[PDB]
Amino acid sequence: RWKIFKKIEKVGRNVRDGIIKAGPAVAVVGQAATVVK
């Protein structure tokens, strides 16, 4: 109702903004690898 919403909403823009702003390799590799395997 609020927790999940605010959470997913925040985290959603957080990651994106973080990856777009700078664009680290750890997060990308990790996330991708985790999502793939």
The answer to whether 27 and 15 have CB atoms below 8 angstroms apart is yes
The answer to whether 36 and 27 have CB atoms below 8 angstroms apart is no
Q: DSSP for the chain, please give it.
A: --HHHHHHHHHHHHHHHHHHHT--SHHHHHHHHHHH-
Going by C-alpha positions, the residue among 21, 30, 34, 1 that lies closest to residue 9 is 1
- Tokens 């959603």 correspond to 12
Sign (positive/negative) of CA torsion 25, 30, 32, 3? negative
- Residues 6+ positions from 24 with CB-CB distance below 8 Å: 18
Distance of alpha carbon 12 from alpha carbon 16, whole angstroms:
6
The answer to whether 31 and 23 have CB atoms below 8 angstroms apart is no
- Residues 6+ positions from 19 with CB-CB distance below 8 Å: 27, 28
Distance of alpha carbon 32 from alpha carbon 9, whole angstroms:
20
